[PDB]
Amino acid sequence: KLSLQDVAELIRARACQRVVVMVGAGISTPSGIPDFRSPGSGLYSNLQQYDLPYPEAIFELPFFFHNPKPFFTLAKELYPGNYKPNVTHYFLRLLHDKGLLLRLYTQNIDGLERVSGIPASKLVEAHGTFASATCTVCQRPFPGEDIRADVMADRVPRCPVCTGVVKPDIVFFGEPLPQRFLLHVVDFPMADLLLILGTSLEVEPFASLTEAVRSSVPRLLINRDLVGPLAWHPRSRDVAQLGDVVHGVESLVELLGWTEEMRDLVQRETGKL
Ligand SMILES: [Zn+2]
Numbered sequence: 001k002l003s004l005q006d007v008a009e010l011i012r013a014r015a016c017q018r019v020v021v022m023v024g025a026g027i028s029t030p031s032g033i034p035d036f037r038s039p040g041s042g043l044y045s046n047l048q049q050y051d052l053p054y055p056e057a058i059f060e061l062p063f064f065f066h067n068p069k070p071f072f073t074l075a076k077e078l079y080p081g082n083y084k085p086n087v088t089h090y091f092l093r094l095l096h097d098k099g100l101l102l103r104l105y106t107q108n109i110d111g112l113e114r115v116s117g118i119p120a121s122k123l124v125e126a127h128g129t130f131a132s133a134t135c136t137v138c139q140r141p142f143p144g145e146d147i148r149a150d151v152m153a154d155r156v157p158r159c160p161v162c163t164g165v166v167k168p169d170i171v172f173f174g175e176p177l178p179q180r181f182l183l184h185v186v187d188f189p190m191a192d193l194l195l196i197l198g199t200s201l202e203v204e205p206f207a208s209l210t211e212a213v214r215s216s217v218p219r220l221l222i223n224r225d226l227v228g229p230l231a232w233h234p235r236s237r238d239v240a241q242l243g244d245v246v247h248g249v250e251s252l253v254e255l256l257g258w259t260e261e262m263r264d265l266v267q268r269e270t271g272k273l
Helices: 004-012 054-059 061-066 069-078 089-095 144-152 181-188 209-210 245-255 261-273
Strands: 019-021 103-105 123-125 128-135 141-143 168-171 194-198 218-223 240-244
Touching: 004 194, 004 240, 019 089, 054 061, 054 218, 054 261, 061 245, 069 144, 089 103, 089 245, 103 181, 123 181, 128 144, 141 144, 144 168, 181 209, 218 245, 240 245, 245 261
Parallel strands: 019 103, 019 194, 103 123, 194 218, 218 240
Antiparallel strands: 128 141, 128 168
C-alpha cells in the first residue's frame, strides 16, 4: 500500500511517465464556483436561489424545454470571463508543462482548464462546453460568442433561422458525450498513473473510467471523501489523499520539488486575466 510520497517518488524516478487525470466540480470550488454536493454551498442546499426542483434538473432536457431560465442563469454566471483558475488548475498546467500530461478528462463546464493554458489537444471536455451552441430544433451550430449578448441580458437565445431555443453544447442527461471522449480507449490502457480530483464520481460513463487503468497503475485521489469505484473496488495501489483539494495538491507539489516553480506560474498567470 503506497503513500503520497511513493507516488511523488515514482514520478521523480521517471517510473511514471504518462499521467491521465479525471476532475470534477471540486477542483473549481476554490475559484468560487459552487459544486453539487458540498454542504451549505453545494447546489443540493441552494435550490431556491436557482428555482430547481433538484440539482440535476438544470441538466435535463424535459425541465430545460419547460423552463430554460435557471440553466441560462448558470450560463450567465459561468460564461467565459467570470471566474479564474486556481492552484489546482495551474498544477495540472504545470504537469503538462513538465511533459507529464497524457490527457486531462474533465466533467466541468467552466472552461477554466482551457483558461489555465492547457492546450485543447491535451483536454477532453467530457460534459461539453460553452465554446459553442446548437439550435435545438434545426441543429444549426453556433460559436459561443453568437449568443453572449442574450445570455448577459437574461434573454433566452433564439435561432435566427428557425426561432428554436439555442442550447450551449453542454452535455445534458441522456445526451451522448462528445466524440473526443472516445480518446479514452487508447488513453486509459496507455496510462501509467491516474489522478482523480474533486469529483463525487456519481456520473457515468465518465465515472467507471477509473476501472480502465491496468491493476499495476496507482490511482491517486485528492478529494474531501473516498468516492466511487475507489471506495467499493479498492485496488492495492490506490492512494487516498483526503482533505482540501488545494491542500492535497500543495503537499504533492512540494514532494515533487515543484513549489517555487508553481508559485512563479500562478503569479504570472492570474495577473494577465
Ligand atoms: Zn434553428
